[PDB]
Design a protein around this ligand. Structure first.
Ligand SMILES: *[C@H](C)[C@H]1/C(=C/c2[nH]c(/C=C3N=C(/C=C4\NC(=O)C(CC)=C4C)C(C)=C\3CCC(=O)O)c(CCC(=O)O)c2C)NC(=O)[C@@H]1C
Ligand SMILES: *[C@H](C)[C@H]1/C(=C/c2[nH]c(/C=C3N=C(/C=C4\NC(=O)C(CC)=C4C)C(C)=C\3CCC(=O)O)c(CCC(=O)O)c2C)NC(=O)[C@@H]1C
Ligand code: NA
Ligand code: NA
Ligand code: NA
Ligand code: NA
Lengths: 517, 517
């Protein structure tokens, strides 16, 4: 009711939101919390009335066998084991309703963080319309081709194309988290009449810390009907804990209202989201949208997850391989320089005679060799005077092992005047008083924000309670990044460091030879 | 002095051995522990006398700058940062000894678990004989070929072949830890006149828990001279903690004596060991042996580690891809069965008409369909009577979601009589009273132990102290494993489970149709 300016309180409310203990359940399925070994129903979603014709009053304190028939759930005397649970997934359960009616579910069990058994019953449309056993062969062929020859981009595209082929989703995206946990849509496959989100960048707050954390424990989220009105667990608290049941790993947990409102604003009728995890860190999501409601049965979700994770394993290997390959390319430059340096009369002469190697060593476009009295400028550099003032600035600030920046202007303001040749600077001190410098030009870089980063959500405060809402503007923002070079890669800096080392060895060997001899 | 029978006390002594706080240092290099910001020497290895001509009495309490000249170690006012440290690695330091002498080191710094700065000085033979910049190109080409077409075995071989090419080691092995942390030598490249360890299996105690733990924190261990007599840190305790310095991440930490004795027994003069880590778990080691002493400088070790880890990243992807590919092959079998099952008059007829699909579904060689009154035997099975007794045994033991074993004889002893067709059994209950069974024959499997598993080391007790020694027998043992089938793979069990599910759906759909109609 009261429009609240975006605050520190509204941001730390967002990052601490207890979404995992929400008690609201998506209305197409039943959640039953079960006390072992009898499988006594201790909580049940209130949609049991409409689905089963039996109220929570009729069901709480009954055993699961009194409510459902099944083939595979026997009465056993101790708590269900992890292996037992995973083999129950999914299992057919059915109830006889009104009189002349089967209602058939596929049930999926898990034990939550506090040891409570949770059973989730999704309607079984036996096997009605979404095969993937055959589509697995097309997905496998696609992966096989990538493994023959591919860029990283080809892997991204295969994930989105094959998940969309298998599922029939109107839109499938690959969403990658960056260093600040902003998101980038790095691949997309969608209907031709839908607008592209490919290349769009989103604030960290769109998928906040509790949502990201959830995806580390729970690989898959599905919402088959965004407009489904959520129903409560009854009671809202678990009888044995007296507290809300932890639904981190729940299929049928209804999403936090603000995310639902976000999807509704976007015209999304159904979604499927699968996480890609590396070394316990959330790397990204396969994010699928449909414009209308859409059921994705458990086996199909698991097939998409299996394929996506096998492709992702191949993406890690591809990233590591490209890094190695680039290091090897740079090692050639290093080796040629060391060969010519130690062969020349004077080692600076060796360097100057091989400028494409010297520049190639760090992926750069200009360089300066400053040794003793001489200053040699190679490739595209600032003019001699500017380099001298820059050298002087580097000398006056306590000599690190290396200085590098991809936007020199914002720590050295006079660099605005040579932004077209040296927005980027890599400076290595050699024997204290000397320097090798490498230079890179401005490259304009555009961040295509999918919403306003400075107005990333909406907050209201009623009765002391802060409420948070998705942003109401659909405008796009492009941030045009200027005075910035391409970034320095770790292997380029290491290659530069390796040249420094080789020069230092030369100087020491020459000092040792003019002592001994 | 007193021969001690191998015990629980000697085994838990082995698993709790504090190797990381050993104060003995390999004699070719110096260790200095340094107090910041002055870099005051608080401990030093006692070989400083011979290497520098200066005793610990002369050095303790001096700053590093009083002892060594360098280009890159400046006096700075706060503790060295992680980025500063890693750029110092390696840095040239040199001392002037006797009078007319340089002694030159490459120094490598780290901050240990307790915040102490440790500097390790290995002699610099500038760049004297072991290039790898060029060999990186051959290693890269080898990796490139694997990525075009390869089995897992090809990846193992590339690691050992290229590390050996780059290093010149007499023997290079890939050592993989199994589920019990026994080791298997799964690849090897060695001089033709040396005996092969390829295919040998070793007890967990050969590389005990403290050694494995060390490799999670410290990727590389090197011992350039196994016969080098280790020298103490002086003092043996750090002045600021009053306790032994944690040398987990130390290059020059001398190995525990029993491992040295092991290497000496094996004729090893030098070693290099690089760990391969996945998801915080130690997967395996690249283990290199030379028959004589051998220096492997820091940069070469890091090059081997980088290559080995890039190949290992590709090995994870290959393992995931082969698993996926096998699941897809099995999914074809599943799909054909479901198609023929739902098309036949009766679904058992569908199964029986496609026996290569039914067997192929689980990688098995025989099967039994037991539904209601009929029992159909497919492929190589036990005789009808034996299958009936087995069915009866399965019925009497509370029905899991699945029973599988790769050695039926050791829980069902009468299975010894049909070991050639059903050493392995996969049994799935369907609708409670029915079963699908799959059968597999005995396949003899040999474990080539590299030493006696029942006498895996030697223990003595003198004066209350238990001492442990490497085993003294060089005999090999082969364990010939009998009455055992090939193991059931997870994807084969899942495929069988998927058939069960499909049959259950059929039965429910037929029960629903004969109710409604
Ligand atoms: C409202 C308070 C704020 C908010 C909160 C919020 N977000 C989520 C979860 C997700 N948000 C997304 C984001 C996107 N999906 C997309 O397709 C795109 C376009 C490329 C975006 C930006 C996604 C994928 C999730 C994961 C959940 C899912 O089912 O996919 C949570 C999670 C809530 C839950 O209960 O599970 C919350 C609380 N989001 C906003 O818009 C506001 C800033
Ligand atoms: C003596 C008490 C027991 C023992 C202890 C022990 N072992 C190690 C470390 C290693 N052992 C090996 C084992 C092998 N290397 C090989 O090439 C082969 C043949 C294939 C084997 C079996 C290896 C590779 C290591 C790692 C250390 C390394 O430098 O390579 C430790 C570690 C000690 C340390 O201080 O670092 C200890 C205490 N080993 C025995 O033989 C006895 C059972
Ligand atoms: Na019942
Ligand atoms: Na962009
Ligand atoms: Na000095
Ligand atoms: Na063997």
């Amino acid at each position: 009711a009261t429009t609240v300016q975006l605050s520190d309180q509204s941001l730390r409310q967002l990052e601490t939101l207890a979404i995992h203990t929400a008690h609201l359940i998506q209305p197409h399925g039943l959640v039953v919390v079960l006390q072992e070994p009898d499988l006594t129903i201790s909580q049940i979603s209130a949609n049991c009335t409409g689905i089963l014709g039996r109220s929570p009053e009729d069901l709480l304190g009954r055993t699961l066998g009194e409510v459902f028939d099944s083939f595979q759930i026997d009465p056993i005397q101790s708590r269900l084991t992890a292996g037992q649970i995973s083999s129950l997934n999914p299992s057919k359960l059915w109830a006889r309703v009104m009189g002349d009616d089967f209602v058939i579910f596929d049930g999926v069990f898990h034990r939550n963080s506090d040891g409570l058994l949770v059973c989730e019953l999704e309607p079984a449309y036996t096997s009605d319309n979404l095969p993937f056993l055959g589509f697995y062969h097309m997905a496998n062929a696609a992966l096989n081709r990538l493994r023959q020859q591919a860029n990283l981009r080809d892997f991204y595209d295969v994930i989105v194309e094959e998940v969309r082929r298998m599922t029939g989703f109107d839109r499938v995206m690959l969403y990658r988290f960056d260093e600040n946990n902003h998101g980038d849509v790095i691949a997309e496959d969608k209907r031709d009449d839908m607008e592209p989100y490919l290349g769009l960048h989103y604030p960290e707050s769109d998928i906040p810390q509790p949502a990201r954390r959830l995806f580390i424990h729970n690989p898959i989220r599905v919402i088959p009907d965004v407009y489904g009105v959520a129903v409560p667990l009854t009671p809202a608290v678990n009888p044995s804990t007296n507290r809300a049941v932890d639904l981190t790993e729940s299929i049928l947990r209804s999403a936090y209202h603000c995310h639902l409102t976000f999807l509704k604003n976007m015209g999304v009728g159904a979604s499927l989201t699968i996480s890609l995890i590396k070394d316990g860190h959330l790397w990204g999501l396969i994010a699928c949208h449909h414009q209308t409601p859409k059921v994705i049965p458990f086996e199909l979700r698991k097939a998409c997850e299996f394929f996506g994770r096998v492709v992702f394993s191949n993406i890690s290997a591809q990233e590591d391989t490209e890094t190695f390959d680039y290091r090897v390319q740079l090692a050639e430059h290093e080796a040629v320089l060391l060969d010519k340096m130690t062969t020349a009369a004077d080692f600076v002469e060796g360097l100057t005679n091989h400028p494409d190697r010297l520049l190639g060593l760090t992926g750069s476009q200009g360089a300066a060799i400053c040794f003793g009295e001489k200053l040699i400028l190679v490739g595209e550099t600032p003019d001699e005077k500017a380099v001298q003032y820059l050298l002087q600035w580097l000398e006056n600030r306590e000599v690190q092992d290396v200085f590098f920046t991809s936007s020199l202007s914002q720590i050295y303001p006079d660099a605005v005047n040579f932004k077209s040749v040296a927005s980027g600077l890599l400076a290595i001190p050699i024997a204290r008083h000397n320097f090798l410098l490498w230079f890179r030009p401005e490259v304009l870089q555009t961040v295509n924000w999918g919403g306003d980063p400075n107005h990333a959500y909406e907050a209201t405060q009623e009765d002391g309670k802060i409420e948070l809402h998705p942003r109401q503007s659909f405008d796009l923002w492009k941030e045009i990044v200027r005075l910035q070079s391409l970034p320095w890669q770790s292997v380029e800096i290491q290659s530069a460091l390796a040249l420094k080392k080789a020069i230092v060895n030369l100087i020491l060997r020459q000092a040792e030879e003019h002592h001994h001899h």
